[PDB]
Amino acid sequence: TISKEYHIDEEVGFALPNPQENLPDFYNDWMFIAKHLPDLIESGQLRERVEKLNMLSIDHLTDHKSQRLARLVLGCITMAYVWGKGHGDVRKVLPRNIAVPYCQLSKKLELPPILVYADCVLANWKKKDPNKPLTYENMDVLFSFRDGDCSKGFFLVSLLVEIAAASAIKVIPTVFKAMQMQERDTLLKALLEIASCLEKALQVFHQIHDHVNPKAFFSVLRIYLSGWKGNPQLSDGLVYEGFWEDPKEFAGGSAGQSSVFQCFDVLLGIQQGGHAAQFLQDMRRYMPPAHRNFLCSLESNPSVREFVLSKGDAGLREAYDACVKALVSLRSYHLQIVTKYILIPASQDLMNFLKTVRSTTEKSLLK
Ligand SMILES: Cc1ccc(NC(=O)Nc2cc([C@H]3C[C@H]3C(=O)O)ccc2N(CC(C)C)CC(C)C)cc1
């Protein structure tokens, strides 16, 4: 079995395969701003170009990849318009001629009108040469914010984790077939292969250190990934001129927008404890609707946890634990990234919540 409807690719997983790089001509005015955000923010010319912008119909965005590219373009255009050079000069009102098409395209794609992980990681890459493989040396992003923002490194290393994970996600029907067929040797190899693929996924995380600089990240890139839900600089949210008369709050950023970590929680039958369910539930809202439909199709399958416990078989318990441990490792290395790239630069909250989820993962071990 596997996807079609859930849009999980055997090669790139939750990411979008071979994402579109160009929009229809009709949207040339958008593409010019997005493609020149580095030059236009540094010069301050960006906000005049957004305000002298006519309102474009979204009707000429006809396929999914075209519409995905347009959301990335409008989201990047939007983040730069709101935060500027980021030293107190915010815009609390997004101009109708960009907000209306952005909100319309968000309604259609069932995502919030703000830059989201499915935009600038999953849909925001190209291969440099397609005849060679998916490595940092042969990959590039479509959009950045500022020269030296380390957009390239932070987005692509993020995407390479999603790709490593695809190696494990594609093993997931074998688990359920082997349970269905009471084929014990197959399910064990499937668990060991999932564990092994999460352990190689952890090794991709090591690459952040070679392409993302903590200061460039904390003081540049993270301002353009900042949202307006619970933000003092936009206490009430952002006004989408012409689409809602009321200001609306939405979050930014967050590794929590990946589906990878929650995907393996559901599989392994790891439940959340605390009220943390609310936060993980809200993270699904910032995911594409197909990927959230997938995480639900997963809870509808028989419990792999109830299956391994019911057999009394110690090899299977050890392979299930290998996966759960590989998951605590990912959450630990996450945490360690938060220390280097946020906590330390902030000294020049989110960690308590993360520690709790890791504890719940570790407590899900069997032997
Ligand atoms: C808009 C947007 C949204 C989302 C991302 N990615 C992210 O947040 N990446 C990210 C951030 C943090 C620390 C800032 C904290 C946080 O987020 O809790 C830690 C790990 C990662 N990952 C892997 C990295 C090794 C590249 C990502 C997932 C785990 C594969 C990038 C852009």
Short mmCIF file of N, CA and C in Angstrom, two decimals, residues 114-277:
data_model
loop_
_atom_site.label_atom_id
_atom_site.label_comp_id
_atom_site.label_asym_id
_atom_site.label_seq_id
_atom_site.Cartn_x
_atom_site.Cartn_y
_atom_site.Cartn_z
N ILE A 114 0.39 32.50 6.39
CA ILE A 114 1.69 32.88 6.96
C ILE A 114 2.72 31.84 6.53
N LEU A 115 3.97 32.25 6.49
CA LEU A 115 5.02 31.37 6.04
C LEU A 115 5.16 30.18 6.96
N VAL A 116 5.09 29.01 6.35
CA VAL A 116 4.91 27.78 7.10
C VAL A 116 5.96 26.78 6.62
N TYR A 117 6.22 25.75 7.42
CA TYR A 117 7.26 24.78 7.04
C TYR A 117 7.03 24.16 5.64
N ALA A 118 5.77 23.87 5.29
CA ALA A 118 5.47 23.32 3.96
C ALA A 118 5.80 24.28 2.81
N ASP A 119 5.94 25.57 3.09
CA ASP A 119 6.35 26.51 2.06
C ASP A 119 7.86 26.54 1.88
N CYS A 120 8.59 27.10 2.86
CA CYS A 120 10.01 27.40 2.67
C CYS A 120 10.97 26.25 3.05
N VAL A 121 10.48 25.06 3.37
CA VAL A 121 11.41 23.94 3.36
C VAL A 121 10.94 22.99 2.28
N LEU A 122 9.73 22.46 2.41
CA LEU A 122 9.26 21.37 1.57
C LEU A 122 9.11 21.78 0.09
N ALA A 123 8.71 23.02 -0.19
CA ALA A 123 8.47 23.45 -1.57
C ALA A 123 9.53 24.42 -2.08
N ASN A 124 10.64 24.56 -1.38
CA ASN A 124 11.57 25.65 -1.62
C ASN A 124 13.00 25.14 -1.85
N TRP A 125 13.14 24.23 -2.81
CA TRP A 125 14.44 23.67 -3.16
C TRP A 125 14.45 23.31 -4.64
N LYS A 126 15.65 23.22 -5.18
CA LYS A 126 15.86 22.71 -6.52
C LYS A 126 17.12 21.85 -6.49
N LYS A 127 17.23 20.89 -7.41
CA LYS A 127 18.53 20.27 -7.67
C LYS A 127 19.33 21.17 -8.61
N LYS A 128 20.65 21.22 -8.39
CA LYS A 128 21.52 21.98 -9.28
C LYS A 128 21.73 21.22 -10.59
N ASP A 129 21.99 19.91 -10.48
CA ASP A 129 22.07 19.01 -11.63
C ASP A 129 21.22 17.78 -11.29
N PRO A 130 20.18 17.46 -12.07
CA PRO A 130 19.31 16.32 -11.70
C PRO A 130 19.93 14.93 -11.90
N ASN A 131 21.00 14.81 -12.70
CA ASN A 131 21.64 13.53 -12.96
C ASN A 131 22.45 13.03 -11.76
N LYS A 132 22.73 13.89 -10.78
CA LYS A 132 23.40 13.57 -9.51
C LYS A 132 22.41 13.55 -8.32
N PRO A 133 22.85 13.05 -7.10
CA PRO A 133 21.89 12.85 -5.98
C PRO A 133 21.60 14.04 -5.07
N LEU A 134 20.70 13.82 -4.11
CA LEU A 134 20.21 14.85 -3.19
C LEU A 134 21.15 15.05 -2.01
N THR A 135 22.18 15.86 -2.21
CA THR A 135 23.09 16.27 -1.14
C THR A 135 23.24 17.80 -1.14
N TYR A 136 23.71 18.35 -0.02
CA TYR A 136 23.80 19.81 0.08
C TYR A 136 24.60 20.38 -1.09
N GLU A 137 25.61 19.65 -1.57
CA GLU A 137 26.49 20.16 -2.62
C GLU A 137 25.78 20.28 -3.96
N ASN A 138 24.70 19.52 -4.15
CA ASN A 138 23.92 19.49 -5.37
C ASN A 138 22.50 20.07 -5.21
N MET A 139 22.23 20.86 -4.17
CA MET A 139 20.89 21.38 -3.90
C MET A 139 21.00 22.88 -3.66
N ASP A 140 19.89 23.60 -3.85
CA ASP A 140 19.84 25.03 -3.53
C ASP A 140 18.40 25.40 -3.21
N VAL A 141 18.21 26.53 -2.53
CA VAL A 141 16.85 27.02 -2.26
C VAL A 141 16.41 27.96 -3.36
N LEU A 142 15.10 28.17 -3.42
CA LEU A 142 14.51 29.11 -4.36
C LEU A 142 14.46 30.53 -3.83
N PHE A 143 14.30 30.71 -2.52
CA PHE A 143 14.17 32.04 -1.96
C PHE A 143 14.91 32.15 -0.65
N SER A 144 15.57 33.29 -0.46
CA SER A 144 16.24 33.66 0.77
C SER A 144 15.71 35.00 1.25
N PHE A 145 16.12 35.43 2.45
CA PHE A 145 15.71 36.75 2.91
C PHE A 145 16.81 37.81 2.80
N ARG A 146 18.01 37.54 3.28
CA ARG A 146 19.05 38.56 3.35
C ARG A 146 20.37 37.89 3.08
N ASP A 147 21.25 38.60 2.40
CA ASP A 147 22.60 38.10 2.26
C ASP A 147 23.14 37.81 3.66
N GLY A 148 23.60 36.58 3.86
CA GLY A 148 24.12 36.15 5.13
C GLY A 148 23.07 35.70 6.13
N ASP A 149 21.80 35.62 5.73
CA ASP A 149 20.78 35.11 6.64
C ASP A 149 20.95 33.63 6.92
N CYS A 150 21.79 32.93 6.17
CA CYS A 150 21.91 31.48 6.26
C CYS A 150 20.57 30.80 5.94
N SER A 151 19.76 31.42 5.08
CA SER A 151 18.58 30.74 4.56
C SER A 151 18.97 29.42 3.90
N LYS A 152 20.00 29.43 3.06
CA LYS A 152 20.33 28.22 2.33
C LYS A 152 20.56 27.07 3.28
N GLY A 153 21.48 27.25 4.23
CA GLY A 153 21.85 26.15 5.11
C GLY A 153 20.71 25.66 5.98
N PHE A 154 20.00 26.59 6.63
CA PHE A 154 18.95 26.19 7.56
C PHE A 154 17.78 25.54 6.86
N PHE A 155 17.42 25.99 5.67
CA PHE A 155 16.29 25.35 5.01
C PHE A 155 16.68 24.00 4.45
N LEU A 156 17.84 23.93 3.78
CA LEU A 156 18.22 22.68 3.11
C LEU A 156 18.60 21.58 4.10
N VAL A 157 19.30 21.91 5.17
CA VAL A 157 19.59 20.86 6.14
C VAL A 157 18.30 20.35 6.75
N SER A 158 17.32 21.26 6.98
CA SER A 158 15.98 20.88 7.45
C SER A 158 15.33 19.91 6.47
N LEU A 159 15.42 20.24 5.18
CA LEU A 159 14.84 19.40 4.14
C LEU A 159 15.56 18.05 4.05
N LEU A 160 16.88 18.02 4.27
CA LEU A 160 17.62 16.77 4.19
C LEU A 160 17.22 15.82 5.30
N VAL A 161 16.73 16.36 6.43
CA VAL A 161 16.20 15.51 7.48
C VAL A 161 14.90 14.90 7.03
N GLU A 162 14.03 15.69 6.41
CA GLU A 162 12.80 15.13 5.89
C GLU A 162 13.10 14.03 4.85
N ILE A 163 14.17 14.20 4.07
CA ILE A 163 14.52 13.20 3.07
C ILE A 163 15.06 11.93 3.73
N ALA A 164 15.95 12.06 4.70
CA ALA A 164 16.41 10.86 5.37
C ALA A 164 15.22 10.11 5.95
N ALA A 165 14.25 10.85 6.47
CA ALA A 165 13.10 10.22 7.08
C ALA A 165 12.28 9.47 6.06
N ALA A 166 12.25 9.93 4.83
CA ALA A 166 11.48 9.20 3.84
C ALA A 166 11.95 7.75 3.75
N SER A 167 13.24 7.50 4.03
CA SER A 167 13.75 6.13 3.97
C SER A 167 13.00 5.25 4.95
N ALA A 168 12.63 5.81 6.10
CA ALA A 168 11.88 5.08 7.10
C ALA A 168 10.39 5.12 6.86
N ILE A 169 9.86 6.25 6.41
CA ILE A 169 8.41 6.34 6.22
C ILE A 169 7.92 5.30 5.23
N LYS A 170 8.68 5.07 4.16
CA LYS A 170 8.26 4.10 3.16
C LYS A 170 8.26 2.66 3.65
N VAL A 171 8.84 2.37 4.82
CA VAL A 171 8.81 1.02 5.40
C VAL A 171 7.48 0.71 6.07
N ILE A 172 6.64 1.72 6.28
CA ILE A 172 5.47 1.66 7.15
C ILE A 172 4.35 0.72 6.70
N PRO A 173 4.09 0.52 5.42
CA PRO A 173 3.15 -0.55 5.06
C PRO A 173 3.68 -1.96 5.36
N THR A 174 5.00 -2.18 5.30
CA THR A 174 5.53 -3.49 5.62
C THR A 174 5.21 -3.89 7.04
N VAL A 175 5.21 -2.92 7.96
CA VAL A 175 4.88 -3.19 9.36
C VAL A 175 3.45 -3.74 9.46
N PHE A 176 2.51 -3.04 8.84
CA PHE A 176 1.10 -3.42 8.97
C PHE A 176 0.78 -4.72 8.22
N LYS A 177 1.43 -4.94 7.07
CA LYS A 177 1.30 -6.21 6.34
C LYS A 177 1.87 -7.35 7.17
N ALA A 178 3.05 -7.14 7.72
CA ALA A 178 3.61 -8.18 8.55
C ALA A 178 2.78 -8.41 9.80
N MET A 179 2.16 -7.39 10.37
CA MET A 179 1.25 -7.68 11.48
C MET A 179 0.04 -8.45 10.96
N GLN A 180 -0.52 -8.00 9.85
CA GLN A 180 -1.73 -8.62 9.36
C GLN A 180 -1.47 -10.09 9.11
N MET A 181 -0.32 -10.40 8.51
CA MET A 181 0.01 -11.74 8.07
C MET A 181 0.66 -12.57 9.15
N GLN A 182 0.65 -12.10 10.39
CA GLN A 182 1.44 -12.69 11.45
C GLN A 182 2.74 -13.25 10.87
N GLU A 183 3.52 -12.39 10.20
CA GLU A 183 4.85 -12.70 9.66
C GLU A 183 5.86 -12.02 10.57
N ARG A 184 6.37 -12.77 11.55
CA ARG A 184 7.18 -12.16 12.61
C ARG A 184 8.57 -11.74 12.13
N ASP A 185 9.19 -12.48 11.21
CA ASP A 185 10.54 -12.11 10.80
C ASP A 185 10.52 -10.86 9.93
N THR A 186 9.44 -10.67 9.17
CA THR A 186 9.33 -9.47 8.35
C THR A 186 9.16 -8.20 9.19
N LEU A 187 8.28 -8.24 10.20
CA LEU A 187 8.02 -7.07 11.04
C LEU A 187 9.26 -6.66 11.82
N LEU A 188 10.03 -7.64 12.28
CA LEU A 188 11.27 -7.36 12.98
C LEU A 188 12.26 -6.67 12.06
N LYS A 189 12.45 -7.19 10.85
CA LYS A 189 13.35 -6.46 9.97
C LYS A 189 12.79 -5.07 9.69
N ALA A 190 11.47 -4.90 9.63
CA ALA A 190 10.93 -3.58 9.32
C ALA A 190 11.21 -2.61 10.45
N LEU A 191 11.11 -3.08 11.68
CA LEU A 191 11.42 -2.23 12.80
C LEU A 191 12.90 -1.94 12.85
N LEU A 192 13.74 -2.93 12.62
CA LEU A 192 15.16 -2.62 12.66
C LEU A 192 15.55 -1.65 11.56
N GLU A 193 14.89 -1.75 10.40
CA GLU A 193 15.18 -0.87 9.27
C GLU A 193 14.65 0.54 9.56
N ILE A 194 13.49 0.65 10.22
CA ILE A 194 13.03 1.98 10.64
C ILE A 194 13.98 2.57 11.67
N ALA A 195 14.36 1.79 12.67
CA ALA A 195 15.32 2.30 13.65
C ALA A 195 16.58 2.79 12.95
N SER A 196 17.12 1.97 12.04
CA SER A 196 18.34 2.34 11.33
C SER A 196 18.15 3.62 10.52
N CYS A 197 16.96 3.85 9.98
CA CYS A 197 16.80 5.03 9.14
C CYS A 197 16.65 6.30 9.97
N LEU A 198 15.97 6.21 11.12
CA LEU A 198 16.00 7.30 12.08
C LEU A 198 17.40 7.54 12.65
N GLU A 199 18.24 6.50 12.80
CA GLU A 199 19.59 6.78 13.26
C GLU A 199 20.41 7.46 12.18
N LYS A 200 20.16 7.17 10.89
CA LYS A 200 20.88 7.93 9.86
C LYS A 200 20.28 9.34 9.73
N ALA A 201 18.97 9.49 9.99
CA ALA A 201 18.37 10.82 10.01
C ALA A 201 18.99 11.70 11.09
N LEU A 202 19.26 11.13 12.26
CA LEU A 202 19.95 11.90 13.27
C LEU A 202 21.29 12.42 12.76
N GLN A 203 22.00 11.66 11.91
CA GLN A 203 23.32 12.12 11.47
C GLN A 203 23.23 13.32 10.55
N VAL A 204 22.08 13.54 9.91
CA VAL A 204 21.92 14.73 9.07
C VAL A 204 21.92 16.00 9.91
N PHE A 205 21.28 15.96 11.08
CA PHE A 205 21.26 17.07 12.02
C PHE A 205 22.65 17.64 12.27
N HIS A 206 23.69 16.79 12.27
CA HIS A 206 25.06 17.28 12.47
C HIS A 206 25.49 18.33 11.45
N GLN A 207 24.82 18.39 10.27
CA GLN A 207 25.21 19.30 9.19
C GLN A 207 24.85 20.75 9.44
N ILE A 208 23.90 21.00 10.35
CA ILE A 208 23.52 22.37 10.64
C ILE A 208 24.74 23.18 11.03
N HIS A 209 25.65 22.56 11.78
CA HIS A 209 26.78 23.31 12.30
C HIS A 209 27.67 23.80 11.16
N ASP A 210 27.65 23.14 10.02
CA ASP A 210 28.55 23.54 8.96
C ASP A 210 27.96 24.56 7.99
N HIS A 211 26.64 24.83 8.06
CA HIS A 211 26.01 25.76 7.12
C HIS A 211 25.17 26.85 7.80
N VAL A 212 24.91 26.76 9.10
CA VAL A 212 24.17 27.79 9.82
C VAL A 212 24.98 28.30 11.01
N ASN A 213 25.16 29.61 11.05
CA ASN A 213 25.91 30.33 12.07
C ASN A 213 24.93 30.81 13.13
N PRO A 214 25.15 30.54 14.42
CA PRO A 214 24.14 30.92 15.43
C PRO A 214 23.70 32.39 15.40
N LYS A 215 24.64 33.35 15.30
CA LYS A 215 24.27 34.76 15.30
C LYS A 215 23.45 35.13 14.07
N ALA A 216 23.90 34.72 12.88
CA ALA A 216 23.15 35.05 11.67
C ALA A 216 21.74 34.53 11.78
N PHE A 217 21.58 33.34 12.36
CA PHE A 217 20.26 32.75 12.54
C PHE A 217 19.42 33.54 13.53
N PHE A 218 19.95 33.80 14.71
CA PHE A 218 19.08 34.30 15.76
C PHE A 218 18.66 35.74 15.49
N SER A 219 19.57 36.54 14.96
CA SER A 219 19.32 37.97 14.75
C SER A 219 18.85 38.34 13.35
N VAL A 220 18.82 37.42 12.38
CA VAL A 220 18.38 37.74 11.02
C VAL A 220 17.26 36.82 10.56
N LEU A 221 17.61 35.54 10.35
CA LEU A 221 16.66 34.59 9.78
C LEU A 221 15.45 34.41 10.67
N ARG A 222 15.69 34.26 11.96
CA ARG A 222 14.58 34.09 12.87
C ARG A 222 13.66 35.32 12.94
N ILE A 223 14.10 36.53 12.56
CA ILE A 223 13.09 37.60 12.54
C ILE A 223 12.15 37.40 11.35
N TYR A 224 12.62 36.85 10.24
CA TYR A 224 11.68 36.70 9.13
C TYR A 224 10.86 35.42 9.24
N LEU A 225 11.20 34.52 10.17
CA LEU A 225 10.32 33.40 10.48
C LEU A 225 9.43 33.67 11.68
N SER A 226 9.53 34.84 12.29
CA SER A 226 8.68 35.17 13.43
C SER A 226 7.25 35.46 13.00
N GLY A 227 6.31 34.95 13.78
CA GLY A 227 4.89 35.17 13.55
C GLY A 227 4.25 36.27 14.38
N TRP A 228 2.93 36.19 14.48
CA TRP A 228 2.15 37.17 15.19
C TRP A 228 0.98 36.49 15.92
N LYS A 229 1.31 35.47 16.69
CA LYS A 229 0.41 34.89 17.68
C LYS A 229 1.17 34.98 18.98
N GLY A 230 0.65 35.72 19.95
CA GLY A 230 1.41 35.89 21.16
C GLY A 230 2.73 36.61 20.97
N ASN A 231 2.77 37.61 20.05
CA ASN A 231 3.92 38.48 19.76
C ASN A 231 3.66 39.88 20.31
N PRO A 232 4.50 40.40 21.18
CA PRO A 232 4.24 41.75 21.71
C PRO A 232 4.29 42.84 20.66
N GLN A 233 5.03 42.62 19.57
CA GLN A 233 5.17 43.67 18.58
C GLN A 233 3.92 43.81 17.71
N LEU A 234 3.08 42.75 17.65
CA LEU A 234 1.76 42.78 17.03
C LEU A 234 0.80 42.12 18.02
N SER A 235 0.50 42.84 19.10
CA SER A 235 -0.23 42.25 20.20
C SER A 235 -1.51 41.56 19.75
N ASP A 236 -2.18 42.10 18.74
CA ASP A 236 -3.50 41.66 18.33
C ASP A 236 -3.49 40.86 17.04
N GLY A 237 -2.34 40.68 16.44
CA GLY A 237 -2.25 40.02 15.18
C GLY A 237 -2.04 40.96 14.00
N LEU A 238 -2.25 40.39 12.83
CA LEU A 238 -2.03 41.08 11.59
C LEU A 238 -3.37 41.29 10.94
N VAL A 239 -3.55 42.48 10.39
CA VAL A 239 -4.76 42.82 9.65
C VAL A 239 -4.53 42.48 8.20
N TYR A 240 -5.38 41.61 7.67
CA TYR A 240 -5.33 41.25 6.25
C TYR A 240 -6.34 42.16 5.52
N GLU A 241 -5.85 43.32 5.06
CA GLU A 241 -6.73 44.35 4.50
C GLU A 241 -7.58 43.76 3.37
N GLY A 242 -8.89 43.97 3.46
CA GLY A 242 -9.80 43.50 2.45
C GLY A 242 -10.26 42.06 2.61
N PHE A 243 -9.68 41.31 3.52
CA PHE A 243 -10.11 39.93 3.69
C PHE A 243 -10.79 39.67 5.02
N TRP A 244 -10.26 40.20 6.12
CA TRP A 244 -10.94 40.24 7.42
C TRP A 244 -10.89 41.66 7.96
N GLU A 245 -12.00 42.14 8.51
CA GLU A 245 -11.93 43.49 9.06
C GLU A 245 -11.13 43.44 10.35
N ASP A 246 -11.13 42.16 11.10
CA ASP A 246 -10.47 41.94 12.38
C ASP A 246 -9.04 41.43 12.21
N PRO A 247 -8.10 41.86 13.07
CA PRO A 247 -6.74 41.30 13.02
C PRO A 247 -6.73 39.85 13.49
N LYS A 248 -5.84 39.06 12.90
CA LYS A 248 -5.78 37.62 13.15
C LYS A 248 -4.37 37.22 13.60
N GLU A 249 -4.31 36.35 14.60
CA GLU A 249 -3.05 35.81 15.07
C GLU A 249 -2.72 34.45 14.38
N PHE A 250 -1.46 34.26 13.98
CA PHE A 250 -0.93 32.98 13.52
C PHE A 250 0.53 32.95 13.95
N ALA A 251 0.98 31.73 14.29
CA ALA A 251 2.35 31.44 14.68
C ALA A 251 3.26 31.36 13.47
N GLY A 252 4.55 31.52 13.73
CA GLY A 252 5.59 31.28 12.76
C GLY A 252 6.33 29.97 12.98
N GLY A 253 7.32 29.74 12.12
CA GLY A 253 8.49 28.88 12.42
C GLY A 253 8.16 27.54 13.03
N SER A 254 9.10 27.09 13.83
CA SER A 254 8.99 25.87 14.63
C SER A 254 9.34 24.60 13.84
N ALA A 255 10.33 23.88 14.34
CA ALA A 255 10.54 22.51 13.89
C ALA A 255 9.29 21.67 14.07
N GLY A 256 8.32 22.16 14.86
CA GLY A 256 7.12 21.40 15.14
C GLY A 256 6.21 21.24 13.95
N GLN A 257 6.43 22.06 12.89
CA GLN A 257 5.71 22.01 11.62
C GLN A 257 6.15 20.84 10.77
N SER A 258 7.29 20.25 11.02
CA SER A 258 7.54 18.98 10.39
C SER A 258 6.52 17.96 10.85
N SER A 259 6.19 17.07 9.93
CA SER A 259 5.35 15.94 10.25
C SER A 259 6.17 14.78 10.75
N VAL A 260 7.49 14.85 10.63
CA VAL A 260 8.31 13.66 10.89
C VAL A 260 8.17 13.20 12.33
N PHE A 261 8.37 14.10 13.29
CA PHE A 261 8.36 13.63 14.66
C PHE A 261 6.98 13.09 15.02
N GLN A 262 5.91 13.81 14.67
CA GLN A 262 4.62 13.30 15.08
C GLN A 262 4.30 12.00 14.35
N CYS A 263 4.74 11.87 13.09
CA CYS A 263 4.53 10.63 12.33
C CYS A 263 5.02 9.43 13.11
N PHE A 264 6.24 9.50 13.65
CA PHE A 264 6.68 8.32 14.36
C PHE A 264 6.12 8.22 15.77
N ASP A 265 5.61 9.29 16.37
CA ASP A 265 4.85 9.10 17.61
C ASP A 265 3.64 8.21 17.37
N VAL A 266 2.84 8.51 16.32
CA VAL A 266 1.59 7.77 16.10
C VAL A 266 1.89 6.30 15.86
N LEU A 267 2.88 6.03 14.98
CA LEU A 267 3.26 4.68 14.60
C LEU A 267 3.56 3.85 15.83
N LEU A 268 4.49 4.36 16.64
CA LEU A 268 4.96 3.69 17.85
C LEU A 268 3.96 3.74 19.00
N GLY A 269 2.81 4.38 18.83
CA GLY A 269 1.80 4.38 19.85
C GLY A 269 2.21 5.17 21.07
N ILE A 270 3.04 6.18 20.88
CA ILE A 270 3.51 7.06 21.94
C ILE A 270 2.47 8.15 22.14
N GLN A 271 1.86 8.19 23.32
CA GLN A 271 0.76 9.13 23.60
C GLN A 271 1.33 10.43 24.19
N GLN A 272 1.32 11.49 23.36
CA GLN A 272 1.88 12.83 23.64
C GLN A 272 3.41 12.78 23.84
N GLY A 273 1.00 13.21 27.60
CA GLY A 273 0.66 13.52 28.99
C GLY A 273 0.97 14.96 29.45
N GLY A 274 -0.08 15.72 29.83
CA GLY A 274 0.08 17.03 30.47
C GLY A 274 -0.92 18.13 30.14
N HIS A 275 -1.39 18.17 28.88
CA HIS A 275 -1.92 19.34 28.16
C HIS A 275 -1.01 19.68 26.99
N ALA A 276 0.04 18.87 26.79
CA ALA A 276 0.90 19.01 25.63
C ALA A 276 0.17 18.61 24.37
N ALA A 277 -0.88 17.81 24.52
CA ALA A 277 -1.70 17.44 23.38
C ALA A 277 -2.20 18.65 22.64
#
